[PDB]
Design a protein around this ligand. Sequence first.
Ligand SMILES: *[C@@H]1O[C@H](CO)[C@@H](O[C@@H]2O[C@H](CO)[C@@H](O[C@@H]3O[C@H](CO[C@H]4O[C@H](CO)[C@@H](O)[C@H](O)[C@@H]4O)[C@@H](O)[C@H](O[C@H]4O[C@H](CO)[C@@H](O)[C@H](O)[C@@H]4O)[C@@H]3O)[C@H](O)[C@H]2NC(C)=O)[C@H](O)[C@H]1NC(C)=O
Ligand SMILES: *[C@@H]1O[C@H](CO)[C@@H](O[C@@H]2O[C@H](CO)[C@@H](O[C@@H]3O[C@H](CO)[C@@H](O)[C@H](O)[C@@H]3O)[C@H](O)[C@H]2NC(C)=O)[C@H](O)[C@H]1NC(C)=O
Ligand SMILES: *[C@@H]1O[C@H](CO)[C@@H](O[C@@H]2O[C@H](CO)[C@@H](O)[C@H](O)[C@H]2NC(C)=O)[C@H](O)[C@H]1NC(C)=O
Ligand SMILES: *[C@@H]1O[C@H](CO)[C@@H](O)[C@H](O)[C@H]1NC(C)=O
Ligand SMILES: *[C@@H]1O[C@H](CO)[C@@H](O)[C@H](O)[C@H]1NC(C)=O
Ligand SMILES: *[C@@H]1O[C@H](CO)[C@@H](O)[C@H](O)[C@H]1NC(C)=O
Ligand SMILES: *[C@@H]1O[C@H](CO)[C@@H](O)[C@H](O)[C@H]1NC(C)=O
Ligand SMILES: *[C@@H]1O[C@H](CO)[C@@H](O)[C@H](O)[C@H]1NC(C)=O
Lengths: 198, 596
Amino acid sequence: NVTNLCPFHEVFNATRFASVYAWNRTRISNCVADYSVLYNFAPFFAFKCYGVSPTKLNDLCFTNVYADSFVIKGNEVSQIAPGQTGNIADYNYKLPDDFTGCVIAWNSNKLDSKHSGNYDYWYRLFRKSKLKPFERDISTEIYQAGNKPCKGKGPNCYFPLQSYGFRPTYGVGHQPYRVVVLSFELLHAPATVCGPKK
Amino acid sequence: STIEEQAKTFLDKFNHEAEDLFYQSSLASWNYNTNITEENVQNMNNAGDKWSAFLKEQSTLAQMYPLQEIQNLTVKLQLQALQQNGSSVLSEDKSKRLNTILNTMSTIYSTGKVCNPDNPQECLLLEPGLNEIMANSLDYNERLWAWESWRSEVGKQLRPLYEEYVVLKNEMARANHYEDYGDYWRGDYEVNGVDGYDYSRGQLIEDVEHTFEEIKPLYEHLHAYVRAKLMNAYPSYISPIGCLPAHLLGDMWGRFWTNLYSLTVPFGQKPNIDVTDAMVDQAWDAQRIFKEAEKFFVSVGLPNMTQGFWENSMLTDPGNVQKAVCHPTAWDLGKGDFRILMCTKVTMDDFLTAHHEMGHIQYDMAYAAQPFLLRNGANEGFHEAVGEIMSLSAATPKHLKSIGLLSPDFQEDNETEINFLLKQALTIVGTLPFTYMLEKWRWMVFKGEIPKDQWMKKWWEMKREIVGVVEPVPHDETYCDPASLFHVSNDYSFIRYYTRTLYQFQFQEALCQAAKHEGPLHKCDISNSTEAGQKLFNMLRLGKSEPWTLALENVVGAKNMNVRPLLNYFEPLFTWLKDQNKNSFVGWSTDWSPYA
Ligand SMILES: *[C@@H]1O[C@H](CO)[C@@H](O[C@@H]2O[C@H](CO)[C@@H](O[C@@H]3O[C@H](CO[C@H]4O[C@H](CO)[C@@H](O)[C@H](O)[C@@H]4O)[C@@H](O)[C@H](O[C@H]4O[C@H](CO)[C@@H](O)[C@H](O)[C@@H]4O)[C@@H]3O)[C@H](O)[C@H]2NC(C)=O)[C@H](O)[C@H]1NC(C)=O
Ligand SMILES: *[C@@H]1O[C@H](CO)[C@@H](O[C@@H]2O[C@H](CO)[C@@H](O[C@@H]3O[C@H](CO)[C@@H](O)[C@H](O)[C@@H]3O)[C@H](O)[C@H]2NC(C)=O)[C@H](O)[C@H]1NC(C)=O
Ligand SMILES: *[C@@H]1O[C@H](CO)[C@@H](O[C@@H]2O[C@H](CO)[C@@H](O)[C@H](O)[C@H]2NC(C)=O)[C@H](O)[C@H]1NC(C)=O
Ligand SMILES: *[C@@H]1O[C@H](CO)[C@@H](O)[C@H](O)[C@H]1NC(C)=O
Ligand SMILES: *[C@@H]1O[C@H](CO)[C@@H](O)[C@H](O)[C@H]1NC(C)=O
Ligand SMILES: *[C@@H]1O[C@H](CO)[C@@H](O)[C@H](O)[C@H]1NC(C)=O
Ligand SMILES: *[C@@H]1O[C@H](CO)[C@@H](O)[C@H](O)[C@H]1NC(C)=O
Ligand SMILES: *[C@@H]1O[C@H](CO)[C@@H](O)[C@H](O)[C@H]1NC(C)=O
């Protein structure tokens, strides 16, 4: 079962990292998934694992791996967990209550902030209802917070999205953070994605 | 959807835009104040214009949702703040006239100067030379000349501008709902909609009258003592039963009596507790002072400064070509950014000032979780009192002994305590009548009781009747003495000091009672105590989400202002003064005048 190495170093270590409301999704399969490629980044703000243990991870083998990446604030990172409420949790990215995987977040103030302000990262603010688990909604229609039918941006009509203003002089809890979520599962399969072993 | 949901959505959008706009404006202002040039002024002006315009349009949109269909009692406060603090009612021509008048008055006050009559080519500004001359010089003629020259060269110009200004302000205030501008100022203390905590705009006047009536005797005893000492000083101008002439109070106006300590010390032989020499010997600096203040604040349970505070704030004057303003201020730029700007030397006064500014920064840090429109003190007096209590607690001999600046071979007899209490009194008690009289005069002027031809007459009559101070030179209606003050000429309220003076002492007595301390109140420290810190934080974190009466009841247990703590603070000094004044007459008569 000699194979090549997985592209972990590519989902991490990227220039553009995608906004939260349009989070990326990469499938990992048919390779050797060495987990020593990470830990080479900054001291993580959070390394919570749910289905397995971080140490009991090198020797284990999976079926398929999904990686999701986006950028959020500092005080919103606590909302990425099974069964949590808040703006980001129910309007941008919702996790199932039986999640089996790990969540990695590390500060990236030195790469995602500018003196004049960075307006290339957005996040949805208004929506009609909640979000189903592992769902995405990328659309732009004027919100109707009123009785009169909405036509355009004006009174009681709002543009759904909004951008951050990341600056290097912001305090902790407002600086950008890079978040990567891995979702493993063990089921009926030839166990394609196995850890490095001989 | 009902009104409340739309109001909540609008509030969310407004907060999320106003945070960024306010941050940009504050950053521009700081960049100007640290690196004074011209392009910084341009950027600051642009940011201010953007912020003002945005507030104007947001108020115009916010004027749509009615206030009588909302029962949440927290949306209502923010909506009222938007509707009241950004609305423009007067026509464009009147607004331009008012702005031009304000700018002209500010420029006249700032650029005003006087020249020596002997040498017209020689001129000196107010702040560098006039303040120093009024402070340290001891000679009747020069002080009288400086006082008269400044009054005649400022008030005469500023009188017509004030006369035109009062009418426009009265029209603007009467436009919305208020009777006049005095009601507009007094509306800050109003509380509505809460049962058992209501406060009307007319209650403040009665409360101030009651507190001053309860304060008067101590002030008159101190006045008699100071008059006797000044008689011992000046032998041909002061009268035994007269009043103190205005040009012998240690400063330009008489707001503070601090500069009379070197002349009226109860016991000259006993030295003070100045610790400048020890700080010089131990090789200290600004960093050490600020670290000590941080440690003191940590010792009571409050959190300490962030890394951005040490990274961004400047604590020493760069000098050289980097011009800057050395007035100590505490900045709150938002988005978790806090800085302090000051030029720190090695002096005990700088120690106390650093403690005061760190207290202000802690107050700003405490409530940084409420909505954008509620991140402010309960009223205009809480913030100053919270700042001042730290300086009160950080000057005790016990704290200095624990720190190490004061030698352990120091003893506290009668005379040291008497001197300390007198020095505190000369600055605290000596300013209350001045503030009360000034605010009362402005209130009558705005209300219209005093006509335009009796301004100076009523001003000096009330000065004699309340402050017990008589002018050295008669003034006709061509003079405008109140305009010579910065606050009066720059459109600022003045009762906040009167409120903070009582608030700080109530807070200090409550905190010392919570720490289980015995002995005189003037010797109290809360450095190690953690109950006091938590109790203070419980009020600090509130912000503006509750009426100030509720916070006051939570802290001290009293709904209204009380003067008992202030009297209890000065009790030994009061007894000593009562024992000392058994010979000289107590009181004053207004019939006397220095000019025959
Ligand atoms: C609604 O709109 C009003 C007016 O538009 C706003 O009211 C202002 O509120 C701020 C803060 O609450 C007031 O700022 C205070 O000004 C005092 C006056 O200082 C002047 O003079 C000094 C020189 O002596 C100058 O250096 C200075 O720049 C001013 O020109 C200051 O003394 C106060 O400082 C105190 O607190 C700071 C910390 O906050 C300490 O560091 C200081 O040492 C000191 O203790 C303070 O800065 C301002 O005066 C108010 N305006 C008016 C006209 O009264 C409301 O904020 C606004 N409400 C909103 C938007 O919700
Ligand atoms: C008046 O309106 C305000 C504004 O909506 C109401 O405050 C709101 O109170 C709810 C709970 O009662 C808060 O929900 C909380 O959300 C957090 C997540 O952020 C969650 O962890 C908590 O468990 C809780 O569910 C809501 O945040 C809060 N609003 C704001 C802006 O903070 C208030 O209750 C209303 N009062 C009356 C009498 O109607
Ligand atoms: C608060 O507690 C600290 C911790 O004990 C005190 O610091 C000590 O103060 C004594 C005073 O004589 C010194 O002998 C010790 O060396 C100090 N310890 C340390 C670790 O510095 C502090 O004095 C207390 N606060 C007050 C006001 O006394
Ligand atoms: C990984 O990060 C380093 C850090 O500078 C960078 O030089 C390198 O190009 C990155 N690898 C990529 C982008 O494939
Ligand atoms: C999202 O992932 C895909 C995976 O191939 C990658 O090609 C793409 O560049 C990623 N998006 C961004 C914005 O980097
Ligand atoms: C101050 O402003 C000048 C003018 O633009 C600028 O060159 C300089 O970098 C700024 N900062 C300092 C510390 O001088
Ligand atoms: C105060 O700052 C020190 C760093 O010098 C830190 O270790 C400590 O935790 C801070 N205090 C609190 C209460 O966090
Ligand atoms: C000083 O205080 C002590 C404390 O008991 C007292 O006995 C003494 O009489 C006081 N002296 C004066 C001059 O007040």
